[PDB]
Amino acid sequence: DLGKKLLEAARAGQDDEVRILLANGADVNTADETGFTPLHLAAWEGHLGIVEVLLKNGADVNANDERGHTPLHLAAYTGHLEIVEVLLKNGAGVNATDVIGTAPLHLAAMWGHLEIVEVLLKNGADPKAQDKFGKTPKDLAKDNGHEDVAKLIDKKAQEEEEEEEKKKKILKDLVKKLSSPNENELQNALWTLGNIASGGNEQIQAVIDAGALPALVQLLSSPNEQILQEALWALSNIASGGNEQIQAVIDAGALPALVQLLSSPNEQILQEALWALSNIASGGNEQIQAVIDAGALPALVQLLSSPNEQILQEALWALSNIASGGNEQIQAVIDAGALPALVQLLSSPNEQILQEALWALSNIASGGNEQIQAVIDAGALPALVQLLSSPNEQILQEALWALSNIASGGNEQIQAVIDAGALPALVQLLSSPNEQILQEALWALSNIASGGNEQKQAVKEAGALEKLEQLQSHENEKIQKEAQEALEKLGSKRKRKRK
Amino acid sequence: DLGKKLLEAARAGQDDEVRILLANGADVNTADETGFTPLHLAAWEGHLGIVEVLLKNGADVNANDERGHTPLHLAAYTGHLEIVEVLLKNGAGVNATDVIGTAPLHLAAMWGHLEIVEVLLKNGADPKAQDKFGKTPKDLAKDNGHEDVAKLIDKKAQEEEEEEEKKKKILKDLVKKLSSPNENELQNALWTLGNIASGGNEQIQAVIDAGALPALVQLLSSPNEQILQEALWALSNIASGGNEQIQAVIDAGALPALVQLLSSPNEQILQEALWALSNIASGGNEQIQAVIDAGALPALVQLLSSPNEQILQEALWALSNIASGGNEQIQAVIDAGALPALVQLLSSPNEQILQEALWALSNIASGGNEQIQAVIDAGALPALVQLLSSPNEQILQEALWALSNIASGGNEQIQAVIDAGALPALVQLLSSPNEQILQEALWALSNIASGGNEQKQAVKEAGALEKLEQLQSHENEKIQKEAQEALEKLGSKRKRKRK
């Protein structure tokens, strides 16, 4: 019985024996009759080392016993500050509750564990969580006479409120500086606001709520190229966030100025405008259709003939983000004449613009049979098939994306792919060392098998059956499943955005 | 020690003491120093009753001693025919061998136990099993002068082939009578042969090998309508068999005579000829193409407008069987103008003819998008949609078959199906008590979801999502999985014979 041995060893403190039993096959999450794991016991007794060891071997940090107790509950009661620290660092439920609504914070407050109270609050313990008796950690600290803990909680709350108020004050001051007649003052506030907005979506909403969006849009018309670049940077950053925040940027009226700047003669201003547009287009179909209605596609397609490879790369980035989502948007991109430039860029020696044109074409081919047939008519398939032999694994994955999306179409498009000689290289890749490339090639073949009898027969003639059958012994069961589905098909979309 | 007592009782013959000691806790398979169980001893001494008792109490019938001898070895040695029979009936190893490769058959033959040799050979004893000296049971029978046993072994080897030859003689006599100048002899032979052919595929091959096919094809030109009808019956029966046997019937040159008899004024001859043709066309694409090349389709299509409903049914049956298999054959059926007549017969008052026309249209729609579009242009979809609300469950399953096959086509055909108003009625049927009808309608909805985004939108607007999610809890797990697959899709031909 390795489970009982592991439970007892963890409870006693035999680190070496715990390691041995786990190495020998002892279930690291073995529980006794009440749901207490060796991790519960280690946290309870105070065996920090065994806690770490068990967590390293796959112990569930939030395992609930029959009463709903977690190892963190136990650590918070006992007063093992270090174990509380480790468990919280390993993902312990700081606000996890038992059957009577007692959370580790309640325990720490009942017994006056000041250190653990502070740690739990710092790791996200809700100070106001009530238990089955309507008692908060502060309530229990007061009822048990722990003035220290109650004042500590009050102090944490006061510091939190003070920091919130100071942060709001500074952000409002920055939004005010944005309208300054002093150049350096406003330029500094611009840069710092951009920095805040680049910390993630949470910071972005702070800036937006302070009211920086309209001020930034106003600066977009400035004649000071330094100021203008700084404003564009801040806008692109805040548009890197959620789709609601992108829509806020759009409502502020940024798109007209941006599409205007697309015709800018200053390469840095133009790069910043393209960045902003692309981050905007990473949103939903509504934001993308807004970008289209602003008249951006003509200028982007025009910029596809740019000699500056960074501007070209960014224009391809934007076109891809717009070609994501709906078929009306993809058709808009097609109507603007982007496909010729994209197929041309498929033969570019620059691998980055190559991957970008591939990403754009894969997105365009994710649409309907109309858009896929337009990709085919533009002559994309020769180059895509040629790219199947690439040793560059990411470019190969890109070409496979595009080919499986083209093969998601009707029998006519699947026949266009087969006539392009894609099957030998696909069956070959089917035995590739890289599992993601194998999966992509298998998806492609599977969407090919979904055609008529002509296409299924062609796949058979290309020698796919043997390798598909061999894949049944693949260690990865997902590949087994997809290959079996393909076999049954013979014997009878996916879009990507980047910010 | 109850085990030793049981051994002693079994060897002595104390039946009552054997049973008693077994009741007192004696192990029925107690082995002594040599590996001999009470069953070994009972078989060796000749205590049939004790053998039965021990085997009924769980005695291992194939227990081996230190030399590999089983109780069957011992019984075959001693000559206890009855004990050998009982042991074999309880699963004794007829080909079990000892350490020197001696099997019970070796023993029975060495000692001239004729009865036991017969029993062992009938139970699968290897006549060619050798022992460590290179001696077969027949070899030992000869070396010890048991000529009787050698003749018995030769007879076991011969008898099966001898009976095969007797059957061949009888079949040759019948095939010869097939060329008799007297009517009655020929009629008797015909009927007896037909019955043989209706006994199953082995009998069919026996008849074919006897050379009956050419005589039957010759008789198809007879002026005695009784003889002709019996010949057609016999050919139909043998064409109910395997596809190689159907191809034998075809090679013998039967199809032209059948196609001629199709214009016969004898309705019973015509019914038998159509039955034979449908059985032939039930085979593979080679047989169906043979039937097509014989020029049968014009007469079948013509018979679709027949007043005799039995003849109409059989013509639809043949056309359906042709419409199975390959798309070349389905196209042949389309070119013969069968789709108009089938679309007409969809409004037939005869429910059987309605199921038959549905089955035909379904097989036609299982092919490629060309054939499905031809079905659509014939105006089938209004009639199929109307039939979706039919209170007849089998006709409904057939209509759903046809619709799920038509919806297997391209996005254009799925849109034609949607335009015919099938979606409300399909969603409605999705709430049917009948699990098979539910599953068929579910297949239909799923093939609609397998189209483009427009079709998925149409399905969503029809209120499919609610019932589809409800179906995730359906008792039938296959239906649960099919409904889940349909949900994921939205958020991104049979043959018949007669004897």
Author numbering:
A (entry chain A): 5 to 496, 501 to 507
B (entry chain B): 5 to 496, 503 to 509
Article excerpt on this structure:
dArmRPs are currently being developed as modular peptide binders. In these proteins, a varying number of internal repeats, binding the peptide, and capping repeats, which shield the hydrophobic core from the aqueous environment, are stacked together to form a superhelical repeat protein. Designed ankyrin repeat proteins (DARPins) are another class of helical repeat proteins which have been engineered as an alternative binding scaffold. Here we show how we applied rigid shared helix fusions and the well crystallising DARPin D12 to construct a crystallisation scaffold that exhibits ideal peptide binding on a dArmRP binding surface without interfering crystal contacts.
Flexible peptide linkers can provide an effective way to ensure peptide binding in the crystal. This resulted in a dArmRP design with six internal repeats, an N-terminally fused DARPin D12 and a C-terminally fused (KR)5-peptide. The construct expressed well and crystallised in space group P21 with two molecules in the asymmetric unit. The crystals of this rather bulky construct diffracted to 3.3 Å and had a high solvent content of 69%. The longer helix of one molecule in the asymmetric unit was straight (chain A), while the other was bent (chain B) and revealed that further design steps had to be undertaken to stabilise the shared helices. An alignment of residues 149–241 of the straight shared helix and the interface to the dArmRP to the design model resulted in a Cα RMSD of 3 Å for chain A and 3.9 Å for chain B. Nevertheless, the two molecules in the asymmetric unit showed a shielded binding surface without crystal contacts. Furthermore, electron density for the fused (KR)5-peptide was visible. The limited resolution, probably caused by the high solvent content and possibly imperfect packing due to the flexible shared helix, did not allow to reliably model the peptide in this data set. The combination of this elongated shared helix with a peptide fusion of the target peptide to the dArmRP yielded the first structure of a dArmRP with a fully shielded binding surface.
